[PDB]
């Protein structure tokens, strides 16, 4: 989706604030060519478009679209790429049309669009051209979203935008229910091993596959193993087949990322509950079950990279070595012969990565410390102890070691003698507060990781996975999760429809040959032509039970459940079932920041905040207005003075905290006096009285 992407702004294009809110909206010419759904939620609406499925580029530089052409009520297969300009003159028919076996219409009266785009209803005489399909207004990532036609387009914009931010897991079970896109998606993605030549398998490995082509020659295929992303995710690849298989050109041999069995997978199938419970689902709060963390089913992979070099200075050169200034040896016994640490060390924050040391120069010391150095009998050296250490809240093993040097023929920019890189990976458990969502735009964070026993559970006693709250339903208009709840439990359950004498009217048309299901099934519904509502109620009417004769889920799709806390059954049947969920990338180490005392700017005395900095917390304006609204002015005098800009106070209040003495009075903000000097620079007798 970074590709196929339509952008408005840029060089040779408009200015962002200087373009009005009229180019942003859609026009009826946008139909069939650019999906109106996929756009970022922030200040880019109308600026970033998304290219649809069946579009194609004009050699002149425009969008061309195929359409089926009908002559005299006979629809041909004559595929004609068309532009919107000639489309204005012409007659575009309807996708879901009562078409009878030739291209012939049952009805004579058909909905149609004019060149204005107004929806008119016409007799079946003028129609030259017909739609090829449904989903023509739909982009690619839009097309993986089932039951779109039953929920809000705004929520569709939300969760549609959310699915690009999914993370890979380590298991990759296929989703229980999808559409005809996911198998069709990854085969053009090119992260998955596609069979180039139709041959037979000769011999595989864990890391390579040596194939046997039918005509003579062979070929090996090195799969990539644990490659680092641009964001630090896992790009491991893995074989799925055996060593002697007659394969065909185009087939899947091995998959890499989130895909499985030829199709994408953003998570797992889980058992869902729809009750509100003890405020732990309070306004989109989400809870979990204990089994998943212990069965590790949501485990993530994160690779973080560090890099530093050895350079030259005016005095001399930087040094990478095992020789350190004054330091412990416990912090050295995991390092190699020549500085850097060895393979497979587990670090904590503050540990030393690369031994880096530079010369000082020739300075003087205090006589008191020079005395102590005579007392402890150790002059150190004329160098500086400035080595590479790990940033904070970080752990994990180091896998790869990459290292360059100027004297060793390595091309690298000037002033530099030597380079090194570090790759640090880490298994991370799922914990509280992380960003979880379902496909229908519903989302939220993890409040409480429960034990396994305080949990809703069946008459057969099977514990539930998550519980969702009621009130996300009405006002956000997102009942498609309920739809796939019923259909999902139909899939886990399985059926065999007992119409041995006569098919019911819900199932009288849809396909044939479908009226059974072996459970743990593999099903799909397309975008606009999937199931219908009485059919959904119809599949619930067959209820192939787990072990014994047991209708746990009634004809209204609810179950009777027990208290997992005190024990008694609940006095109402509860909507429950299965839902396919997913996990995103906003972990708690990412957005955490904290600081008592650190680095500051050189221009101002303000704290500086970046990646390797602790971060600083930007305090605004209306905040100060509300501080005035309390009138807690001593707080304000604390904030803007001893915490912001006055250097000479910071040592005083910090040292007072050290001794536990009184809080000193906040002195004059010296940053204020800087303005006065600027006024005195410009012919101003300014004065205080």
């Amino acid at each position: 989706t970074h590709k196929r992407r339509l952008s408005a702004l840029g060089p040779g294009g408009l200015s962002r604030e200087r373009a009005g809110l009229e180019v942003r909206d859609v026009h009826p010419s946008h139909y069939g060519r650019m999906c109106p759904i996929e756009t970022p939620e922030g200040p880019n609406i109308g600026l970033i478009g998304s290219l649809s499925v069946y579009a194609r580029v004009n050699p002149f530089g425009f969008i061309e679209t195929p359409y089926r052409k009908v002559v005299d009520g006979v629809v041909s297969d004559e595929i004609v790429y068309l532009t919107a300009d000639e489309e204005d003159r012409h007659v575009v028919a309807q996708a879901n049309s009562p078409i009878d076996a030739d291209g012939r219409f049952v009805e004579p009266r058909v909905l149609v669009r004019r060149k204005a785009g107004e929806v008119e209803y016409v007799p079946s005489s003028e129609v030259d051209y017909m739609d090829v399909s449904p989903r023509q207004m739909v982009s690619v990532a839009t097309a993986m979203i089932p039951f779109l036609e039953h929920d809000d387009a705004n929520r569709a914009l939300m969760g549609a935008n959310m699915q690009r931010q999914a993370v890979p897991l380590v298991r990759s079970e296929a989703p229980l229910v999808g559409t005809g896109m996911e198998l069709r998606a990854a085969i053009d993605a090119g992260d998955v091993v596609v069979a180039e030549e139709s041959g037979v398998i000769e011999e595989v490995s864990a890391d390579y596959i040596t194939v046997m082509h039918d005509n003579g020659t062979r070929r090996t295929y090195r799969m990539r193993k644990f490659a680092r992303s641009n964001h630090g995710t896992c790009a491991n690849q893995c074989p799925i087949v055996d060593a002697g298989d007659r394969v065909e050109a185009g087939q899947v041999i091995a998959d890499g990322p989130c895909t499985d069995d030829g199709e994408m997978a953003l998570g797992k199938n889980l058992l869902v509950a729809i009750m509100p419970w003890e405020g732990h689902n309070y306004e989109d709060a989400i809870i979990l079950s204990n089994r998943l963390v212990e069965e590790d089913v949501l485990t993530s992979i994160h690779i973080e990279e560090h890099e530093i070099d050895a350079r030259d200075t005016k005095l001399g050169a930087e040094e990478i070595t095992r020789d350190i200034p004054n330091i412990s040896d416990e912090v050295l016994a995991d390092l190699d012969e020549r500085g850097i640490v060895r393979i497979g060390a587990e670090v904590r924050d503050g540990d030393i990565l690369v031994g880096k040391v530079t010369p000082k120069g020739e300075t003087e010391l205090t006589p008191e410390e020079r005395l102590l150095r005579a007392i402890f009998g150790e002059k150190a050296r004329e160098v500086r102890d400035t080595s590479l250490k790990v940033p904070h809240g970080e752990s994990g093993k180091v896998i790869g070691i990459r290292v360059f040097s100027r004297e060793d023929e390595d091309e690298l920019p000037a002033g530099v003698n030597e380079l090194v890189r570090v790759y640090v990976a880490q298994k991370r458990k799922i914990s509280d507060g992380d960003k979880l969502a379902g496909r229908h735009g519903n989302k939220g964070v993890i409040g409480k990781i429960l034990p396994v026993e305080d949990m809703p559970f069946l008459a057969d006693g099977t514990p539930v996975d998550i519980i969702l709250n009621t009130h996300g339903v009405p006002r956000r208009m997102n009942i498609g999760q309920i739809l796939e709840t019923h259909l999902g439990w139909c899939a886990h359950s399985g059926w065999k429809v007992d119409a041995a004498k006569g098919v019911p009217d819900w199932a009288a048309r849809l396909p044939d040959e479908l009226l059974e299901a072996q459970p743990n099934a593999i099903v799909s519904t397309p975008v606009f032509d999937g199931a219908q509502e009485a059919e959904l109620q119809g599949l619930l009417s067959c209820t192939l039970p787990n072990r014994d004769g047991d209708v746990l889920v009634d004809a209204d799709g609810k179950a009777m459940l027990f208290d997992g806390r005190s024990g008694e059954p609940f006095p109402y049947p509860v909507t429950v079932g299965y839902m396919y969920i997913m996990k995103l990338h906003h972990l708690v180490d990412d957005k955490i920041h904290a600081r008592s005392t650190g680095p500051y700017s050189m221009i101002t005395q303000q704290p500086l905040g970046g990646k390797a900095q602790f971060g600083g917390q930007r305090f605004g304006e209306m905040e100060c207005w509300a501080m005035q609204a309390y009138g807690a002015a001593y707080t304000l005098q604390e904030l803007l003075t001893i915490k912001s800009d006055d250097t000479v106070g910071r040592v005083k209040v910090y040292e007072a905290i050290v001794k536990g003495e009184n809080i000193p009075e906040p002195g004059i903000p010296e940053s204020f006096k800087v303005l006065l000097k600027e006024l005195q620079s410009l012919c101003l007798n300014v004065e205080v009285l």
């Binding site: 198998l183 899947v252 030829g262 479908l514």
Partner: peptide, 27 residues
Amino acid sequence: NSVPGAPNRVSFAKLREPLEVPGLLDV
């Protein structure tokens, strides 16, 4: 459906599709 190593997945397509999806990287 025109895919060699495809697993079976049952659908609710009432219609057919006369034209297949084109290649996505062709843009």
